[PDB]
Design a binder for these strands. Structure first.
Ligand SMILES: [Mg+2]
Ligand SMILES: [Mg+2]
Ligand SMILES: [Mg+2]
Ligand SMILES: [Mg+2]
Ligand SMILES: [Mg+2]
Ligand SMILES: [Mg+2]
Ligand SMILES: [Mg+2]
Ligand SMILES: [Mg+2]
Ligand SMILES: [Mg+2]
Ligand SMILES: [Mg+2]
Ligand SMILES: [Mg+2]
Ligand SMILES: [Mg+2]
Ligand SMILES: [Mg+2]
Ligand SMILES: [Mg+2]
Ligand SMILES: [Mg+2]
Ligand SMILES: [Mg+2]
Ligand SMILES: [Mg+2]
Ligand SMILES: [Mg+2]
Ligand SMILES: [Mg+2]
Ligand SMILES: [Mg+2]
Ligand SMILES: [Mg+2]
Ligand SMILES: [Mg+2]
Ligand SMILES: [Mg+2]
Ligand SMILES: [Mg+2]
Ligand SMILES: [Mg+2]
Ligand SMILES: [Mg+2]
Lengths: 102, 61, 89, 65
RNA sequence: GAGCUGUAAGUAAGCUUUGAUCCAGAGAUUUCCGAAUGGGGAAACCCAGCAUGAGUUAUGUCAUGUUAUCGAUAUGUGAAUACAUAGCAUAUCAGAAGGCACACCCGGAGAACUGAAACAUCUUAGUACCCGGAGGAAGAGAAAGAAAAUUCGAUUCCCUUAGUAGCGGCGAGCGAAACGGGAAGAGCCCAAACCAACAAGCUUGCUUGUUGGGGUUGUAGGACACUCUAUACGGAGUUACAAAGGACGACAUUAGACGAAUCAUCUGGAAAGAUGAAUCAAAGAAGGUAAUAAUCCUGUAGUCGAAAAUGUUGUCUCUCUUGAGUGGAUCCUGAGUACGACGGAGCACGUGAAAUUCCGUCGGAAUCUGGGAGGACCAUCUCCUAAGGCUAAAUACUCUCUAGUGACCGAUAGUGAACCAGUACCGUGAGGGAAAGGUGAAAAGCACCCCGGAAGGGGAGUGAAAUAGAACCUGAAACCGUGUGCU
RNA sequence: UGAGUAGCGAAAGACGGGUGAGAAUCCCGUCCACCGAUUGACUAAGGUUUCCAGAGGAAGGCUCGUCCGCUCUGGGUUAGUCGGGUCCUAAGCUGAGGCCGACAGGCGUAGGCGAUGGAUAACAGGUUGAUAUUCCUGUACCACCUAUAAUCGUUUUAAUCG
RNA sequence: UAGAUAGAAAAUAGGUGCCCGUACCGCAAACCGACACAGGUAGUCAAGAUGAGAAUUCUAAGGUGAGCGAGCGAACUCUCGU
């Protein structure tokens, strides 16, 4: 996946459309990523469970990678990603500005 | 598994035909006669067709 | 091969009772004779073995969900020690 | 132990390490049987080292032949 | 190139940018049974010999290697029985075995129901089945051919000739071929005469056996005699034509890489939809993404890439190798063969006027002024030259792999099998042989409270929806209830 | 639908006390009854974990169920002498060479395999929830090995193997 | 006996002795009968009273009360007594 853990990405699709956050986790096999403050789910947790406290738990849920776009460093605008080989190393390049994403 | 040693003359299959042209399977057997002949320079009793023996082509010892 | 011969110790109520009588139970390789077991115990634990008693356990049917299968066949050896002791724990 | 380190070891050294590794594995198996082992991952780590030791030994023997 | 320790969740312990997991090439390990092969055996086990090694005071025990049969090739011993022949022992051999693709090929052996409105000839059919041998194809194949022209020039396959000519209780039915049009094309090597060498019979006559040379045919060719030409110059080649190799290059296959261009609003749980304004296109194939996306993702067009292995192929190298004439004295040119009779079979052709071709039995030629064929046979003419082999391609089929396609199926369909199916189950066995898909976008899979032993339920909460709560999309009918207007 | 119908598979139960959400049906006790050449005790086939303990009550059990040959979890089978093998052979099976046969294959010799028979050394007591001629206790036997050996022998042999 | 070869051992002491089966049912609810099925399943042991007896009847050792019950006490059917 072009999107990687720790990247800052705008959400371009879903309920959280127009929200920007760091990628907490990436699930390669599922083609899904976790973004902070995005796709929050309220999960019923038993106090009977190993955790002493029990109740509804709010955590981010995985979102499809296609619904997130990397933000251009210069303009802070969502951009498709390109790869250029520099000094024998492939580099992620923002299509909008041509800057190296990371 | 009986055949002429010299020529490989062997039984063949065909039909026995009645006057009404009824057909029954039959065999034609070679006239194989057990004879002592030299094999590998050593006398051996083997089955040979009378045709092969004819004209003294096969020496019997 | 001594390590290969003796797979593991057996810890059960009957086994523990035997341990009081200086008899030690080990699951062993299914192909080994009792003489091999005696020598293997002596090498590993540096003890003297009075006798080895051996028995075979058949594979046992076990069902998980809709899947039916068998446990592994087992060879169990009980080793009486003339001298020394084995500290399993 | 990775193959590179094993390759540095002499044939006798590998043989000694194979003996040592097997004893360690046996101890772990008895510990697991008695429920005394928490670090279960050690068992597999020892197994793969023994496999590596044997591989290097075999490679040498084939090279000799 | 950042996650990873399969399904398969979860827990635990861990691994990984000092490059995990993962993907491709190569290698290592690879228990036991099974042809199964040390012997035995009710497969997956039991019991040994020999050699070497481990252990033991020693015995017991253990490890490794080796030990089937048959064949072939050697070597040594060697009966009745003098010689020597069985026989016997030993060694060697990537020798054979066994399996499968329920296909295609060649061969052995070979039905019946059926049709003939019965049935026997005939048909079904040389089909099914069985068995043997294969090969990647097989078989066939360089005229003792087809013919009757101004002839053609191995074989195989397609079209056509034709449902013709024929065959046929002349019934049912069976059913060509040559010509002509095409696919593909390639031609070769022996036997013999004769020469040289070796060996045996010892005329030690020159007759045999072996090796090398020579020679290959119909326009008769060859030997033989003679005359030119040439020692690989040239030419040919591992697909026949003789048979192994080496070097370098190219291409292909087996992992991959880059790869254009969209935003806003409206509805909604969510936009890809609608609306408006843009953009790319050698890319508007396709799939996915919270509804229908050329521009969000994976891709596509296009372009690039291989350490290693394999295949194909080109050029060198390598290997092998003389090629033509003239002459008509003599010689050679495939024998128990051709052929005939009798009995069968095969030829579209059922014994017929039956050529052509095979088998069994018996008989049995000729030799270039020879022999065979042109559908009985004879003459004439014409065309060939049997009784020895080899030979690519065009043709057949698909267990399998890769890339695709469909006015093909869509869970009673489509494979028997969308699912842990040749399973469950059934049978002594051969064998027979099922049923069974769908929560949601996401597991967010109902904290907590209440009745109940539990099951199950009522709330609360999650969700767009729970009347989506687990064989959980939709939810017909039969069928079973509860209530109600009229009776 | 038939229909809350037929059936619920040879039999003697009763009561008390427990347990439990629930008891004709489970546990325990007393009395009663039934078999006793046997409904008792072994054991070969065959089956294959059904065995023991704790737990459970959906389904199975012709009712019920707190219970079970059911479900769940964890356990249980110990041999020089017993049965079999490392001994023997019968019928039979197989079968080097061999004989025969379209193929496949049939037959058969030497030799193998093959108990239902022959040979063959351990008994009594104790012990667990579940094994016992197997464990343990006591007292034995058999084969082999090592050492020390009364004695005997010491190459036509006269001790010894055969 | 043919053969083989210097060693043989009454005893004594010490030591070695493998594999497979072993649970449990087994005239049965666990085997063969689709069933927790009145059928079938080789062999061994088998007490007392009675008796010729392994018959008969009642008991022992040991095991069992049988996996629907409670009422009522019609016809009819079955099994049985008179
Ligand atoms: Mg074997
Ligand atoms: Mg008819
Ligand atoms: Mg008819
Ligand atoms: Mg061919
Ligand atoms: Mg060649
Ligand atoms: Mg793109
Ligand atoms: Mg939009
Ligand atoms: Mg004829
Ligand atoms: Mg004519
Ligand atoms: Mg359709
Ligand atoms: Mg449907
Ligand atoms: Mg189907
Ligand atoms: Mg089906
Ligand atoms: Mg009625
Ligand atoms: Mg009634
Ligand atoms: Mg009734
Ligand atoms: Mg009953
Ligand atoms: Mg009686
Ligand atoms: Mg029980
Ligand atoms: Mg019930
Ligand atoms: Mg036989
Ligand atoms: Mg044979
Ligand atoms: Mg017996
Ligand atoms: Mg018991
Ligand atoms: Mg028992
Ligand atoms: Mg009987």
């Amino acid at each position: 996946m072009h999107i990687k853990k720790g990247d800052n990405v705008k959400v371009i699709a879903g309920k959280d459309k127009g929200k920007e956050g760091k990628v907490i986790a990436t699930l390669p096999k599922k083609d899904r990523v976790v973004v902070e403050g995005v796709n929050i789910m309220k999960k019923h947790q038993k106090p009977t469970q190993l955790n002493p406290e029990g109740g509804i738990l709010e955590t981010e849920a995985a979102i499809h990678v296609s619904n997130v776009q990397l933000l251009d460093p210069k303009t802070n605008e969502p951009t498709r990603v390109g790869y250029k080989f520099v000094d024998g190393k492939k580099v992620r390049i923002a299509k909008k500005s041509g800057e190296e994403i990371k | 598994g009986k055949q002429c040693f010299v020529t490989g003359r062997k039984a063949s299959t065909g039909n026995r035909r009645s006057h009404a042209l009824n057909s029954t399977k039959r065999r034609w057997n070679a006239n194989l006669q057990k004879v002592r002949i030299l094999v590998d320079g050593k006398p051996k009793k083997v089955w040979v067709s009378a045709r092969a023996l004819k004209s003294g082509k096969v020496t019997r010892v | 091969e001594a390590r290969d011969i003796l797979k593991r110790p057996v810890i059960t109520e009957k086994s523990s009772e035997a341990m009081a009588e200086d008899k030690y139970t080990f699951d062993v390789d299914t192909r080994v004779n009792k003489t091999q077991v005696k020598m293997a115990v002596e090498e590993i634990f540096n003890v003297k073995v009075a006798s080895v008693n051996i028995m075979n356990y058949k594979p046992k049917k076990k069902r998980m969900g809709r899947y039916q299968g068998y446990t592994n066949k087992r060879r169990k050896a009980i080793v009486t020690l003339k001298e020394g002791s084995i500290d399993l724990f | 132990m990775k193959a590179k380190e094993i390759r540095d070891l002499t044939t006798s050294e590998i043989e000694e390490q194979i003996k040592s590794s097997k004893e360690e594995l046996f101890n772990l198996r008895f510990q697991l049987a008695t429920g005394q082992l928490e670090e279960t991952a050690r068992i597999r780590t020892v197994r793969k080292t023994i496999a590596r030791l044997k591989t290097v030994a075999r490679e040498r023997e084939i090279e000799q032949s």
